[PDB]
Amino acid sequence: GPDLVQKLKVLRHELSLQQPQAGHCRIEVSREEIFEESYRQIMKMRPKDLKKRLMVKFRGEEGGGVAREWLYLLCHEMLNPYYGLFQYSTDNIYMLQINPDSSINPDHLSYFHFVGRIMGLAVFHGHYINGGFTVPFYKQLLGKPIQLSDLESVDPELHKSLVWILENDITPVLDHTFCVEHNGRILQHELKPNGRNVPVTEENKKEYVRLYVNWRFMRGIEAQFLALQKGFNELIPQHLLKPFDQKELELIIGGLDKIDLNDWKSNTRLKHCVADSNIVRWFWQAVETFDEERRARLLQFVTGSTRVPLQGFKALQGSTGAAGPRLFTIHLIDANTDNLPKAHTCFNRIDIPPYESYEKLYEKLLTAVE
Ligand SMILES: CCOC(=O)c1c(C)[nH]c(C(=O)N(CC)Cc2ccc3c(c2)OCO3)c1C
């Protein structure tokens, strides 16, 4: 709380001291080749050059304020799975993770080092990017261990079984060793040296669960993660992150998930209504009134998910029909004003009856959502 506020000020003050008063960090890339061009221009600089005031300009545009736009666009474009560095999770929708098969590109480690530098530059200049990584990824990047509690949301079944180990006498029921498996070929991993020959007992099961928790996230991505963290720490040294505790890191990480209302409203299709009509202004008014958890519940009420792809509301998918985005739709219909708004989750549509006032829309929409 108030100690977190002050820790953030110490961090920002320390970072500001590393920025030279004179000098600039010059970048000039195109929008359609921002990843490859930024890769070559950034990997040419010293870490101290990256700490200079950003001097950015796009391909052939006049545009200071362009450096904010450049960094934000590069932060989202570098996570695009086309580049083979990151892939979507099969545990939670629209979440990202390092692709363990990134070894295909033999220069992958220099690209992960580059991604780390850009993530470090975002923190350095005060940008909050909703990268969509898991809480364990972000804790590890910020220099802290993963907690068993952080596994519950990613892998509830593994979490339940590791919790079972810690809370019960395993002796008459389980016969595990410090060796774990995962995939086409089956790969064995010894959690600690000679692990295959170390049976899990009451005496060492705490170490077993602790090692298994880390492996569940680090599995096949350890070299990639190390290079990423290396780039990140060239901008954000690990000692400056030491004061933040597990709880403060969870608050900072949860704040990254903020739904972008600008991107939501810019990418909303309107059916039988205009952008200035009372029903549409009242809907966006009620959304602004809702806290984050209520904004997430509204997004889940209409789309079935509490998140949107990394590209944003423009990449929103529908369930059926021709391939292509199915934008979030506000549909003003002809219906009973006592009726609730109706969600058509297959098509990301909310059918809204013609309410008389803002206060009636707010209550009906809140009743539908809660
Ligand atoms: C401990 C103090 O934390 C901070 O002050 C802080 C600030 C100012 N920004 C960030 C932050 O946004 N990220 C963490 C690196 C997420 C992120 C950035 C760039 C990305 C990305 C995700 O996906 C690819 O590009 C944090 C945590």
Numbering used by the authors: 375 to 437, 441 to 560, 563 to 749
Task: Pull text from the paper.
The structure of SMURF1 is typical of a NEDD4 subfamily member, with a N-terminal C2 domain for cellular membrane localization, WW domains for target recognition, and a catalytic HECT domain that binds E2 and mediates target ubiquitylation through a surface-protruding catalytic cysteine.
The analysis showed that in unbound-SMURF1, I631 of the αH10, along with other nearby residues, occupies the cryptic cavity, preventing small-molecule inhibitor binding. In the presence of Cpd-8, the αH10 is displaced, inducing allosteric elongation. In this altered confirmation, an electrostatic bond is formed between the αH10 D636 and C-lobe R686. The independent mutations D636G, R686A, and N507A did not alter enzymatic activity but conferred resistance to inhibition by Cpd-8, thereby demonstrating the importance of αH10 stabilization of the inhibited form of SMURF1.
